[PDB]
Design a protein around this ligand. Structure first.
Ligand SMILES: N#Cc1ccc(-c2ccc(S(N)(=O)=O)cc2)cc1
Ligand SMILES: N#Cc1ccc(-c2ccc(S(N)(=O)=O)cc2)cc1
Ligand SMILES: [Zn+2]
Length: 258
C-alpha cells in the first residue's frame, strides 16, 4: 500500500505524504487558451532525437516508461523557454478508462484520451536524481492523444505491452524512434510546474504541444489491458492514472503562437 489512483490512495490523498501537493506551482493545470500570453520572443523548440537510444520498457505500477540511455547528449531538447540543454531520459503516458478522459493537462477544460510525457533533465545538474531537486531541473514535453486514425509510430510500444502486464515487469526495448510520436507542428504552451505524481517536486518547465496526435481505438484499448498490481496480486486495470487540474495560482501560461 502506497500512493496511487484508487478510491483510497488517489490524488486527493497525496498531500498527506507529499505536502507540496498543495504548493504554489503544481501540475497539471487547465490551459485557458484565451488567457495564455503570446510571447514572440520565445524561440522555436529544438527537438533532436535522431540519435536516441531506447533501452527498456518498464511497468512501474503507475504507468509504463520507455527508458533511454541518457549518458551522452544523444536525444536532447533545447530552445523554447529553456536555457541550456535537456537530455531525454524516458517517456510515458497517462490515460483514461474511457476515450473522454485520460489527459492530465486540459485545454479550455477539454480532456483528451491520453497524454504523452517526454521527460528531460537539465544537463547542468549531471543526472536525473540531482535535477529533480532543482527548480529548473526538468523539461517535460507533453503531447495530447485523441482517438481517430492510428499512430504508426506508437505501434511498437503497443505490441510489447503484453510482456509487461504487471508492476515490476520490464522488457528489452531497443531502437525505438520517439520522433514517431510527435505531431506535425511544434507550436506550444509553456508554464512552470511540477511532477504530476508523487513526489510532486516543483522542478518542471512544462512545454505542452498545441497539436494532439491521433491514435486508434485499438491502440488506447491495449493501454487499458495493463495492470497496476504485481503478478499474483489482485488484478486492477491500469486506467485513469491521471491527476486532475490544479490551481494555477500565481502563474502565467505563455504561448509560442498567435
Ligand atoms: N488498506 C489500505 C491502505 C489504503 C491506503 C493507504 C494509503 C497510502 C498512501 C497514501 S498517500 N497518497 O498519501 O501516499 C494514501 C493512502 C494505505 C493502506
Ligand atoms: N524517485 C523518483 C521519481 C519518481 C517519479 C518521477 C516522475 C517523473 C515525471 C513525472 S511527470 N508525469 O510529471 O512527467 C512524474 C514523476 C520522478 C522521480
Ligand atoms: Zn507524466
Amino acid at each position: 500500500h502506497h500512493w496511487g489512483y484508487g478510491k483510497h490512495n488517489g490524488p486527493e490523498h497525496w498531500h498527506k505524504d507529499f505536502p507540496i501537493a498543495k504548493g504554489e506551482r503544481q501540475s497539471p493545470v487547465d490551459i485557458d487558451t484565451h488567457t495564455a500570453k503570446y510571447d514572440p520572443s520565445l524561440k522555436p523548440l529544438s527537438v533532436s532525437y535522431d540519435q536516441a537510444t531506447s533501452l527498456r520498457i518498464l511497468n512501474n505500477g503507475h504507468a509504463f516508461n520507455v527508458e533511454f540511455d541518457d549518458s551522452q547528449d544523444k536525444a536532447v531538447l533545447k530552445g523554447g523557454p529553456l536555457d541550456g540543454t535537456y537530455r531525454l531520459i524516458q517517456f510515458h503516458f497517462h490515460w483514461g478508462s474511457l476515450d473522454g478522459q485520460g489527459s492530465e493537462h486540459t485545454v479550455d477544460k477539454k480532456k483528451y484520451a491520453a497524454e504523452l510525457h517526454l521527460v528531460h533533465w537539465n544537463t547542468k545538474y549531471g543526472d536525473f536524481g540531482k535535477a529533480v531537486q532543482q527548480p529548473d531541473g526538468l523539461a517535460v514535453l507533453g503531447i495530447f492523444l485523441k482517438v481517430g486514425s492510428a499512430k504508426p509510430g506508437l505501434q511498437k510500444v503497443v505490441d510489447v505491452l503484453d510482456s509487461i502486464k504487471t508492476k515490476g515487469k520490464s522488457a528489452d526495448f531497443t531502437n525505438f524512434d520517439p520522433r514517431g510520436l510527435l505531431p506535425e507542428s511544434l507550436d506550444y504552451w509553456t508554464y512552470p510546474g511540477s511532477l504530476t505524481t508523487p513526489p510532486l517536486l516543483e522542478c518542471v518547465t512544462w512545454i505542452v504541444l498545441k497539436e494532439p496526435i491521433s491514435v486508434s481505438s485499438e491502440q488506447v484499448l491495449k493501454f487499458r489491458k495493463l495492470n497496476f498490481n504485481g503478478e499474483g496480486e489482485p488484478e486492477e486495470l491500469m486506467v485513469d492514472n491521471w491527476r486532475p487540474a490544479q490551481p494555477l495560482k500565481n502563474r502565467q501560461i505563455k504561448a509560442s503562437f498567435k
